[PDB]
Amino acid sequence: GAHLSSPLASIAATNKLCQSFQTFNICYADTGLLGAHFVCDHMSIDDMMFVLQGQWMRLCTSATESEVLRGKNLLRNALVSHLDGTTPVCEDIGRSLLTYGRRIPLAEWESRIAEVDARVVREVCSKYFYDQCPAVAGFGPIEQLPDYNRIRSGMFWLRF
C-alpha cells in the first residue's frame, strides 16, 4: 500500500510506475555487482529511471541515521532468519570456505553491523556511485528508454 516507508516502494507503486522491482548484490572474487531489477509498463518506463537515481543520490549527501536503523535492523533480521533448516547452513559453509575460508563470524556480523554509521555510509556510496560509468541492460519494448548520455549526465546531480 501507499503507506510504505521506502520512497520508491510507495511512489513507484503510487502511480504503479512499476509492476515490480527489486535489487541485487553479488560480489565476485575480484569483482562485485550493484543494482536493481524492475518491471513496468512501457509508456511510463521513463519514470522509474528518473525516480530510481536520486534514491541513490540523495543518500550520497543528505542521508540519515534513523532510516538505517530499520535496515540495520532488517539485515540483522535478515541474516538471523537465514539459519532455519539443516541444508542452508551446509550451503553457507561451502561458499564461506570458497570465499572467506573458515569464517563464520556469527556474532561478529553484528559487530560488523555495529560498525555502520551515517558517515560510514555517506563515505561508502561516495566511492561507487556519484559520477560513475554505469552499464545498460534492456530488452524489448525498450523503446522509450531514455538514451544513454542522459543516464550518464543523470547519474551525478548538478545538486538539483
Partner: protein, 81 residues
C-alpha cells in the same frame, strides 16, 4: 501519443554501444577519414561544377565582348572620319 511510446512497431533489432570514456575523440581521425574526402568530393563533382565553368567564361567572355564595344572608338571607325 507520448512522443516516443506509440511511434511505431519494431521487432528484433539489437544495438551495441559503449560509454564515451571507453574510447577517444580521435580514433584514427586523420588516417581513416582523409580517404573519405574523395568518395564524397568525387561523387557530386561530376554533377555540379561544370555549369559554373560556363558562367566564368561568360564573365570574361562578355566583359571582353563589352570592353572593345566601347573602350576604343577609333576601332570600327578609326579617327579618320
Amino acid at each position: 501519443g507520448r512522443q516516443f511510446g506509440h511511434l511505431t512497431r519494431v521487432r528484433h533489432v539489437i544495438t551495441y554501444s559503449l560509454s564515451p570514456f571507453e574510447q577517444r575523440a580521435f580514433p584514427h581521425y586523420f588516417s581513416k577519414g582523409i580517404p573519405n574526402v574523395l568518395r564524397r568530393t568525387r561523387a557530386c563533382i561530376l554533377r555540379v561544377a561544370p555549369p559554373f565553368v560556363a558562367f566564368y567564361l561568360v564573365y570574361t567572355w562578355g566583359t571582353q565582348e563589352f570592353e572593345k564595344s566601347k573602350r576604343k572608338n577609333p576601332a570600327a571607325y578609326e579617327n579618320d572620319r
